[PDB]
Amino acid sequence: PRIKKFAIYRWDPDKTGDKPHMQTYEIDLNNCGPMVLDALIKIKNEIDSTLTFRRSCREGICGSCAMNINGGNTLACTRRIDTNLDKVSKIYPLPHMYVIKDLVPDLSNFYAQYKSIEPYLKKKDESQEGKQQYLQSIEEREKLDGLYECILCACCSTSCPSYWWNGDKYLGPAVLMQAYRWMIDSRDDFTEERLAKLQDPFSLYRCHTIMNCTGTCPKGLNPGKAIAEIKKMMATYKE
Amino acid sequence: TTAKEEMERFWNKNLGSNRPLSPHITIYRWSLPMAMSICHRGTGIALSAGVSLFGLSALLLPGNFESHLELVKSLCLGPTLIYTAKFGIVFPLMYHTWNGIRHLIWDLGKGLTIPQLTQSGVVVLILTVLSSVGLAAM
Amino acid sequence: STQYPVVDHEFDAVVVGAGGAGLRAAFGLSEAGFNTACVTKLFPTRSHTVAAQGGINAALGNMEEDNWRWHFYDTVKGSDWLGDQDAIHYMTEQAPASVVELENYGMPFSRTEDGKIYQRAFGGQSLKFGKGGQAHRCCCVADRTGHSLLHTLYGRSLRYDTSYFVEYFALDLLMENGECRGVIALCIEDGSIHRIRARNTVVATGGYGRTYFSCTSAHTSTGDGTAMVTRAGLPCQDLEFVQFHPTGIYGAGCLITEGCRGEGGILINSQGERFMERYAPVAKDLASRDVVSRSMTLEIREGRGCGPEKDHVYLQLHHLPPEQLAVRLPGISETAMIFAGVDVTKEPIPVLPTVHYNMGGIPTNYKGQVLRHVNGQDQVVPGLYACGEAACASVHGANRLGANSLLDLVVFGRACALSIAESCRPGDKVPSIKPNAGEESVMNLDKLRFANGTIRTSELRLSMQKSMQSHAAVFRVGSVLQEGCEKILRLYGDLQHLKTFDRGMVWNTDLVETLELQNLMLCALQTIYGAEARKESRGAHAREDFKERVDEYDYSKPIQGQQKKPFQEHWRKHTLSYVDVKTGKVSLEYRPVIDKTLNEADCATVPPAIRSY
Amino acid sequence: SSKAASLHWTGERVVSVLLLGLLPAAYLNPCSAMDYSLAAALTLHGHWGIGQVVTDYVRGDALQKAAKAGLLALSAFTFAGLCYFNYHDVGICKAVAMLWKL
Numbered sequence A: 001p002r003i004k005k006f007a008i009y010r011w012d013p014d015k016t017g018d019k020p021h022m023q024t025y026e027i028d029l030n031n032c033g034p035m036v037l038d039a040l041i042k043i044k045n046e047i048d049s050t051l052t053f054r055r056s057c058r059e060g061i062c063g064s065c066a067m068n069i070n071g072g073n074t075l076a077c078t079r080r081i082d083t084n085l086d087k088v089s090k091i092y093p094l095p096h097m098y099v100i101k102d103l104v105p106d107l108s109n110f111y112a113q114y115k116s117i118e119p120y121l122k123k124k125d126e127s128q129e130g131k132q133q134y135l136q137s138i139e140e141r142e143k144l145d146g147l148y149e150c151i152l153c154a155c156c157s158t159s160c161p162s163y164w165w166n167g168d169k170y171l172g173p174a175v176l177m178q179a180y181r182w183m184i185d186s187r188d189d190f191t192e193e194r195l196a197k198l199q200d201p202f203s204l205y206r207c208h209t210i211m212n213c214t215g216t217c218p219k220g221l222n223p224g225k226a227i228a229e230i231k232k233m234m235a236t237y238k239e
Numbered sequence B: 001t002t003a004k005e006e007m008e009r010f011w012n013k014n015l016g017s018n019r020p021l022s023p024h025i026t027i028y029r030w031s032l033p034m035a036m037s038i039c040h041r042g043t044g045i046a047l048s049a050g051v052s053l054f055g056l057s058a059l060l061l062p063g064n065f066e067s068h069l070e071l072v073k074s075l076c077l078g079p080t081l082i083y084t085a086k087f088g089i090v091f092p093l094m095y096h097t098w099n100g101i102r103h104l105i106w107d108l109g110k111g112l113t114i115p116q117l118t119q120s121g122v123v124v125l126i127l128t129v130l131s132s133v134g135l136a137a138m
Numbered sequence C: 001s002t003q004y005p006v007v008d009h010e011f012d013a014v015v016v017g018a019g020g021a022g023l024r025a026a027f028g029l030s031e032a033g034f035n036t037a038c039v040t041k042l043f044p045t046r047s048h049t050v051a052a053q054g055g056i057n058a059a060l061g062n063m064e065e066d067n068w069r070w071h072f073y074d075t076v077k078g079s080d081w082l083g084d085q086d087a088i089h090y091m092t093e094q095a096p097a098s099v100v101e102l103e104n105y106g107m108p109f110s111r112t113e114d115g116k117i118y119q120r121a122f123g124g125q126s127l128k129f130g131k132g133g134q135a136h137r138c139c140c141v142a143d144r145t146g147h148s149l150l151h152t153l154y155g156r157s158l159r160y161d162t163s164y165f166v167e168y169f170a171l172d173l174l175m176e177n178g179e180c181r182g183v184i185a186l187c188i189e190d191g192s193i194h195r196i197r198a199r200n201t202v203v204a205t206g207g208y209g210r211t212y213f214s215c216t217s218a219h220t221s222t223g224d225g226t227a228m229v230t231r232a233g234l235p236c237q238d239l240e241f242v243q244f245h246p247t248g249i250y251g252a253g254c255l256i257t258e259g260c261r262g263e264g265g266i267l268i269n270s271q272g273e274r275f276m277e278r279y280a281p282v283a284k285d286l287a288s289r290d291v292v293s294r295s296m297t298l299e300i301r302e303g304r305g306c307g308p309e310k311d312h313v314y315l316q317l318h319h320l321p322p323e324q325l326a327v328r329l330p331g332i333s334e335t336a337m338i339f340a341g342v343d344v345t346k347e348p349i350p351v352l353p354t355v356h357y358n359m360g361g362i363p364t365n366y367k368g369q370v371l372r373h374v375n376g377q378d379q380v381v382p383g384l385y386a387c388g389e390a391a392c393a394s395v396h397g398a399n400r401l402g403a404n405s406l407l408d409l410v411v412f413g414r415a416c417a418l419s420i421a422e423s424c425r426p427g428d429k430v431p432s433i434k435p436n437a438g439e440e441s442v443m444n445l446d447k448l449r450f451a452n453g454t455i456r457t458s459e460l461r462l463s464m465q466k467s468m469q470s471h472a473a474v475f476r477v478g479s480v481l482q483e484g485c486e487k488i489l490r491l492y493g494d495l496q497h498l499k500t501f502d503r504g505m506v507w508n509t510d511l512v513e514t515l516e517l518q519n520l521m522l523c524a525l526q527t528i529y530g531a532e533a534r535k536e537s538r539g540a541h542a543r544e545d546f547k548e549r550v551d552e553y554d555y556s557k558p559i560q561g562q563q564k565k566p567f568q569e570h571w572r573k574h575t576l577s578y579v580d581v582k583t584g585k586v587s588l589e590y591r592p593v594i595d596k597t598l599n600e601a602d603c604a605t606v607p608p609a610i611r612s613y
Numbered sequence D: 001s002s003k004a005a006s007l008h009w010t011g012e013r014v015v016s017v018l019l020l021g022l023l024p025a026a027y028l029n030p031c032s033a034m035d036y037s038l039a040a041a042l043t044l045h046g047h048w049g050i051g052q053v054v055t056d057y058v059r060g061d062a063l064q065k066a067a068k069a070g071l072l073a074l075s076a077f078t079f080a081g082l083c084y085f086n087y088h089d090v091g092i093c094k095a096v097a098m099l100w101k102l
């Protein structure tokens, strides 16, 4: 028999000026799955179903969980509960974001920012599209590993202090790493205009190499290292 | 709906709501490279304040540097209080110096992996101490 | 009612669902200059297609030389001849064009030494119509194909003027005299009610695998479109044919790709034998889904299983070059660890046959148009389409072929796009709707919203899931099935005895996970009742009491000195199921399979045969 | 569209190595030239740096305009002062020297 405590951020938008408060729950860990989501689900099912959160895959590929657990941003479905009964787990919504309800942040801006980099392949001549597979050597292809696997979970950008103070105009690591993913895609023709789109104070340059992003990626990616690669490209490119 | 309209919509929705912003600094777990980052901010801000205060007092205050040095020899401080006032000036400087080097290695793209940040973090921290004590001893 | 804010929308088209199939349909319509709306209860990228691992089939001729007609043959065979050959012809032909579309879109396929799309071996695929041995036509992005597919599709979709109702919950269709007028949805964000009316409506809501206790499916795989169709009084085809993927992780039931076997991964029991060598001599470990899982689940019957409570098998990978395991199978390596604490390059993964895919769904044209059944005949339902796992053009038949669903998605996504593109014009007269329309959904919503019953949504869902698990598994008998039937029908009654707690408008996940249970019930009801009625062993459906394939002939011996069985006497036919919304009474009937391809000259019909690997 | 943002980024990195290199050189070669080029590098790099902190934290259009205007004034007086000190006083190399043997 093993009880664990969970301190969980709460807020009901329909409860007339309800104020954000922590609610604590208790879970027999022998009666629960290894991961934090398993507990989040178990309390939803048996204890309180007024608890509201985003989940889907429970396998860590949809990037639906993405919340603040014990100070760090990962995916609940992938983060395992600390067997240490002495520590009380503290579950929060993703930092410096608007809470719609409980652990549910308004991710609209995060998405709008992703749209803005135009995250798709672009050719100068698009007449011949649809009819032949494009050439790309494994060499040109290796340059994509650790970039394409991004889950758009928003753990990174939402851990970046620069994104906290300047989330509106600063694109943040997740988006920025993607713009780079398309920059180094051999099949893309618009590398110069992708860079030229980041010529302002805020879009790229609010990054001060804090490195929370890489430090927190639940997928073990290095958004920050890509941000520095963009920076080099920004300085050295022509026209 | 454009990306810009979407952003524009995001702000006008939320600023006219009663939604709370989720906690951040007050909850987010600090790490060695995170702390070493605001310290780069602080030390820089302090160092610039020092220099600003130096050139500004050179324009407003009467008497030369030599006048102010003798002015200081008044109620002359203990060797272990002139060294303290000496160490608390090279510490802000020597730190921001070594981490600034680290920031440039980074601009070059070298050593940006997490375990490399825990290595480059300690090495800067030690070099700070060794060069802060080294210089206040001169 | 009356107190709910009903907002109206007028479009040319509406796509319910933004998985692979949904997105392809959605910008496909926009691409063609149609004022399209998409409705999805998740963020497009969260959709289950994003979890897809193995790859996407097409006879591109990159590895060896290929013919899409061999792909055809494999598919129809694998379908155990419940598969409509007109659709299979369409799909397998459109495949190379479709994959090249995706690559051209930006999909970062793994590459060959020629800088072409890397393809690999997969379960039960051959060259030269089953003669030229194992074929390598499964196109992949290393290990995260669905993920990459969904992302590139989402990427592409930003380029067109489509309107995306993200986290909107489609409640029902808007129907008027057998004609689809649009949808009625819940804006999860504020809890408001939206009636979107369009001239055409595409339903791409994915599977309902979450009718079971253990499945590789997303928590959000709940047959919501399936049920909207059932609530319309429309038929649902072949819902009893449920795919049990051989290799899903023993614990949480996460998927380990079939690409493991495709790359040379072996399956081993407690005795140590490569049991997929005596169970299926020719194709071996890389055989059909139903045969492999049948063998696995049969191996546990013998007692030769591995584990603590004695209930799983071992997928082996360690003998493969670890370098190969790093390039081909990176995604499973994390999850094999994370969810099982297993090092892929050292120890064998613990796997178990678990629910994976729903070949059953809404009956469909090869054109994507939803079929009803009138006078023993097919009738196209005006203004209504379906595609992907939610659909049943039955390109997959009685057993879906590995790497064919992602293909299904994009092919027919495009089909629905084009069918509308050809059948009408943008700006065409969008049909009107009653001021009273959808009132039934809003009412059932409000009823569920304030429910003061005796049973928790969670508790009833668990009853359904464990019932289906013990009464509709890999092996079936009428005794267990009939008990399973009444079991489910009993639980259907309990839907007026359900307790909800959350009574808020904004993000009422309590309320929706109930609407989903409503939805899941309707699905499981038809699945189990369909399974009861079918008295044969075809594809995924295996009856202990009817071990044999009941066809119009006995295709084991030669067909001629032989009299053909009448329709309602053999079983080689599609199951159509309905249910009265109030009583939960499943009535059902049948329509014929299609054997004629789109052209006999280009692609020969393949007549039924003994199906074995 | 110019590449102004990326040039200003590089500009900074240049004065940084310039200022990094100027420290040993001020110890090894204490002179009046050193005294002036240290004054330039000190004030520029500091001005750009606080500029970063200004852009980061000073939300608003009125405030951002002022905070930069005063920062410019602060850096102008700081440079003029160090130039005055190098001309009509000890000079910064010698100033440190005098201050350190103390």
Ligand SMILES: *Cc1cc2c(cc1C)nc1c(=O)[nH]c(=O)nc-1n2C[C@H](O)[C@H](O)[C@H](O)COP(=O)(O)OP(=O)(O)OC[C@H]1O[C@@H](n2cnc3c(N)ncnc32)[C@H](O)[C@@H]1O
Pocket (backbone or CB within 6 Å): C016, C017, C018, C019, C020, C021, C022, C039, C040, C041, C042, C043, C044, C047, C048, C049, C050, C051, C052, C053, C054, C055, C056, C145, C146, C168, C169, C170, C171, C204, C205, C206, C207, C216, C217, C218, C221, C224, C225, C255, C356, C357, C358, C387, C388, C389, C390, C402, C403, C404, C405, C406, C407, C409
């Ligand atoms: C489970 C699984 C399946 C799978 C796979 C791996 C796993 C773990 N790997 C595959 C592979 O490698 N190759 C392949 O060919 N298939 C593979 N599969 C099967 C396949 O991925 C799925 O069957 C298929 O992707 C289903 O996709 P579809 O496009 O039909 O839709 P979806 O991705 O499941 O998502 C459904 C969308 O519909 C929306 N929805 C659902 N209900 C509603 C309501 N009420 N209102 C509004 N929208 C709704 C969802 O939001 C979602 O976007």
Ligand code: HEM
Pocket (backbone or CB within 6 Å): A208, A209, B040, B041, B044, B045, B047, B048, B051, B096, B097, B098, B100, B101, B103, B104, D016, D017, D019, D020, D023, D042, D043, D045, D046, D047, D048, D049, D050, D052, D053
């Ligand atoms: C010892 C040599 C020095 C080097 C190599 C150096 C280098 C740097 C670098 C690379 C940064 C930017 C780091 C980032 O990207 O966030 C920086 C920040 C800054 N520095 Fe220095 N520096 C040095 C000394 C000084 C001195 C003596 C002052 C005082 C005038 C100073 C004032 C600042 C300020 C105000 C900032 C901005 C803080 C920030 O935005 O984070 N530096 N320095």
Ligand SMILES: Oc1c(Cl)c(Cl)c(Cl)c(Cl)c1Cl
Pocket (backbone or CB within 6 Å): A161, A162, A208, A210, B034, B035, B037, B038, B041
């Ligand atoms: O503004 C900042 C904040 Cl809030 C933190 Cl926590 C850090 Cl580490 C840094 Cl570097 C900056 Cl600039």
Ligand SMILES: O=C([O-])CC(=O)C(=O)O
Pocket (backbone or CB within 6 Å): C052, C053, C054, C055, C245, C255, C256, C257, C258, C259, C357, C401, C402, C403, C404, C405
């Ligand atoms: O449904 C599929 O084709 C497959 C699947 O689980 C895989 O091998 O990734």
Ligand code: SF4
Pocket (backbone or CB within 6 Å): A063, A149, A150, A151, A152, A153, A154, A155, A156, A157, A173, A174, A177, A216, A217, A218, A219, A220, A221, A223
């Ligand atoms: S880079 Fe990592 S943390 Fe950021 S959105 Fe992508 S997967 Fe999430």
Ligand code: F3S
Pocket (backbone or CB within 6 Å): A156, A159, A160, A161, A162, A172, A173, A206, A207, A208, A209, A210, A211, A212, A213, A214, A223, A224, A227
């Ligand atoms: S957390 Fe930050 S400011 Fe840059 S290195 Fe990472 S985005």
Ligand code: FES
Pocket (backbone or CB within 6 Å): A054, A055, A056, A057, A058, A059, A060, A061, A062, A063, A064, A065, A066, A075, A076, A077, A078
């Ligand atoms: S639920 Fe899909 S990542 Fe956690």
